[PDB]
Design a protein around this ligand. Structure first.
Ligand SMILES: Nc1nc2c(ncn2[C@@H]2O[C@H](COP(=O)(O)OP(=O)(O)O)[C@@H](O)[C@H]2O)c(=O)[nH]1
Ligand code: ALF
Ligand SMILES: [Mg+2]
Lengths: 317, 111
């Protein structure tokens, strides 16, 4: 039996990993189970396009065309229309026209300045498929959904003759006070970091850089006396988003001492070291680090197989 | 029979039925997220009251129990007068709706 904690700051991808455990080591999602996410895809898709449009008002970005102002109004009129899981063709059209607009796209490019779901562009670029009356979300759609976790949620699965008790937790500051409840006898901790957060700011404090928050948190967890004998795994997640972002946005936003080049390979290396240097007991302890795309099942399957082999190694000693 | 069927339709239905609220409280206790419903019920109380002095004390009291960074039951919200907590109440409502309520309906407590 193995007690596994999923920890990390909010939106680092813990719940996405939990879903992957169901996909890989339970039975996948059934069609009915996928149908239950339909409402969540639509809400995520609507709230994303709305967030962008409110941002335009704050940031003072005009629409590429005047007619979109009417589309904007109609968006809010129909915003609650999808709560029973139906996107009317009227609503689909409004969202299509808004998303195509040059002004909306200019605001989306500035997302860094406000709070926006990572999956926004994924749904919005796939609106035709998502819009159909017959629409059944795919496993990728479900993995892409955003639903803020509150509390502690226990899950069971089996892999290589081991019974995993796994704990998913909320990562926002408020939720962290509850973590102490399941710290006893922890076999392994998977700590998730959103690589793509390097230039973003916290949802709970618009002045604090998300990565620095994540490092402070990892510092606390990593060196905690509860986890002296715990295998500590680091998931530098969202590598896919990080790869697109590092071309556009310099890492010096986050680490102003960085003198290296703004390229996936160097930037990622630098981040890894920053986190691993927070290990105080380097003589004793080791961090097992993997670059993950949580929403990618083949990637998560490979990474978790390696993690499991490490756990097996460290429970002979 | 009818009572359980109505709780499955929406969180609104669950939170209006006081027996529904009891069973849901019991579920949140197990997941360490009971502060959410308590905070929500507190806001519904706050709305109803008209006495300016009874309102000012309760507004402070809701802030210290649920909203302060030092608060023991701090609610996970995306950081006087009756409807002053609307934004926040709606946020916690949606947190429950898409997350813990979703799991509640799959639970033994319900089935
Ligand atoms: N593109 C991409 N999206 C991800 C990745 N990991 C998580 N997400 C998405 O980011 C959002 C936050 O994930 P979530 O698991 O809820 O974060 P949590 O608060 O730590 O549990 C969700 O919409 C996920 O689908 C990733 O590696 N790549
Ligand atoms: F930390 Al989260 F949903 F934001 F699990
Ligand atoms: Mg989560």
């Amino acid at each position: 039996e193995v007690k596994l904690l999923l920890l990390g700051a909010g939106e680092s991808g813990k719940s996405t990993i939990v879903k992957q455990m169901k996909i890989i080591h339970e039975d996948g999602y059934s069609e009915d189970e996928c149908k239950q996410y339909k409402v969540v895809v639509y809400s995520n898709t609507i709230q994303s396009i709305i967030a962008i449009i409110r941002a335009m008002g704050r940031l003072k970005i005009d629409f590429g065309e005047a007619a979109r102002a009417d589309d904007a109004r109609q968006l809010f009129v129909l915003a609650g229309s999808a709560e029973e899981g139906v996107m009317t063709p009227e609503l689909a059209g409004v969202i299509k026209r808004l998303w195509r607009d040059g002004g909306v796209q200019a605001c989306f490019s500035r997302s860094r300045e406000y709070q926006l779901n990572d999956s926004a562009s994924y749904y919005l670029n796939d609106l035709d498929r998502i819009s159909q009356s017959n629409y059944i979300p795919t496993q990728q759609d479900v993995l892409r959904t955003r639903v803020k976790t509150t509390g502690i949620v226990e899950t069971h699965f089996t892999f290589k003759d081991l019974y995993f008790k796994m704990f998913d937790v909320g990562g926002q500051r408020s939720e962290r006070k509850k973590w102490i409840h399941c710290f006893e006898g922890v076999t392994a901790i998977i700590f998730c970091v959103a690589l793509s957060d390097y230039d973003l700011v916290l949802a709970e404090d618009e002045e604090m850089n998300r990565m620095h928050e994540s490092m402070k948190l990892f510092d606390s967890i990593c060196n905690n006396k509860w986890f002296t004998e715990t295998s500590i795994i680091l998931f530098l997640n969202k590598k896919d988003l990080f790869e697109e972002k590092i071309k556009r946005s310099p890492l010096t936003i986050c680490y102003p001492e960085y003198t290296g080049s703004n390229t996936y390979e160097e930037a990622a290396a630098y981040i890894q070291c920053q986190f691993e240097d927070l290990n105080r007991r380097k003589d004793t302890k080791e961090i097992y680090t993997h670059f993950t795309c949580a929403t990618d099942t083949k990637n998560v399957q490979f990474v978790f197989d390696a993690v499991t082999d490490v756990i097996i190694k460290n429970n002979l000693k | 029979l009818k009572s359980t069927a109505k709780w499955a339709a929406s969180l609104e239905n669950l939170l209006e039925d006081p027996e529904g609220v009891k069973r849901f409280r019991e579920f949140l206790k197990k997941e360490f997220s009971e502060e959410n419903v308590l905070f929500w019920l507190a806001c519904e109380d706050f709305k109803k009251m008209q006495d300016k002095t009874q309102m000012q004390e309760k507004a402070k009291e809701i802030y210290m129990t649920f909203l302060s960074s030092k608060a023991s039951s701090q609610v996970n919200v995306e950081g006087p007068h009756p409807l002053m907590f609307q934004k926040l109440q709606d946020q916690i409502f949606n947190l429950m709706k898409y997350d813990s309520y979703s799991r509640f309906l799959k639970s033994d407590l319900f089935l």
